[PDB]
Design a protein around this ligand. Structure first.
Ligand SMILES: C[As](C)(=O)[O-]
Ligand SMILES: C[As](C)(=O)[O-]
Ligand code: NA
Ligand SMILES: [Zn+2]
Ligand SMILES: [Zn+2]
Lengths: 154, 153
């Protein structure tokens, strides 16, 4: 519901992180975590597979790592913004921490069963169809498909 | 045939949990074995306290310690974990297509993940290992607030 007032701020930060990751030579997937009560940014991140040799730092995981350790209650009134619809692992992180809302840049270049699983587990998912996100991810997939396939375990 | 490596995998996972306990962290350990030849691709434990990490659960730390791998490697692996996986760690198993998860115990913790893995075609074996139950219960007795932080409670 009413946390959607933060969604342009959150998606703009997530897209800035994706574009920074793209410039660094990584997968252009970015995220951020916003406190719904006052719009504060708890953290922001992007995929660090190529930057750090990481098998786990998807953009959403890197976002949560960059927030640092938090008391469980903090997550219960946040929104996680991601430029791309989440894989099952990133979905599971949202569910484990009880983050109530996930706002997704696009789900055209990639969608797992996680998007719907978030909804059936009681989380809100909003897909904003941001063409900046679609274009940068399609450019990556077109130019480096085998690096994309590595990021999703294919 | 992959069950032939389960004593090796759970012994490594327990060793990793005991090392994490000694380091002052959450005593949850793991390892990933190549079912084809028994080789240890990686081993790890929870690094929440050691690294100030909100994401390095034992199973995530194990996958990070394997390094980057071709997707095809994961398809004939077993992930060993001393404790039944949360929804995030369940989701990592699904995303990488790891076919088997061998779990030390599900008495101190179980998520909807255990069943969800099976719904989605992954084998789950719960060995009910007393060493794993004892170390996790000791930690929860001493530091329940730190355990709760690890599962977003
Ligand atoms: C959208 As993804 C590959 O960071 O789970
Ligand atoms: C069993 As767990 C807290 O590492 O998902
Ligand atoms: Na899909
Ligand atoms: Zn992911
Ligand atoms: Zn976990």
């Amino acid at each position: 519901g009413m946390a959607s007032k933060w969604d342009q701020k959150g998606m703009d930060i997530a897209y800035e992180e994706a574009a920074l990751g793209y410039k660094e030579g990584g997968v252009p997937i970015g995220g951020c975590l916003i406190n719904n009560k006052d719009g504060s940014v708890l953290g922001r991140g992007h995929n660090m597979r190529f930057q750090k040799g990481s098998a786990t730092l998807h953009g959403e995981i890197s976002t949560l790592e960059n927030c640092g350790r938090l008391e469980g209650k903090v997550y219960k009134d946040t929104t996680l913004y991601t430029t791309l619809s989440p894989c099952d692992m990133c979905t599971g992180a949202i569910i484990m921490y009880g983050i109530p809302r996930c706002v997704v840049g696009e789900n055209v270049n990639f969608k797992s069963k996680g998007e719907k699983y978030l909804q059936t587990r009681g989380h809100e998912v909003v897909v904003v169809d941001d063409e900046r996100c679609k274009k940068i991810m399609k450019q990556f997939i077109d130019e480096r498909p085998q690096d994309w396939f590595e990021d999703i375990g294919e």
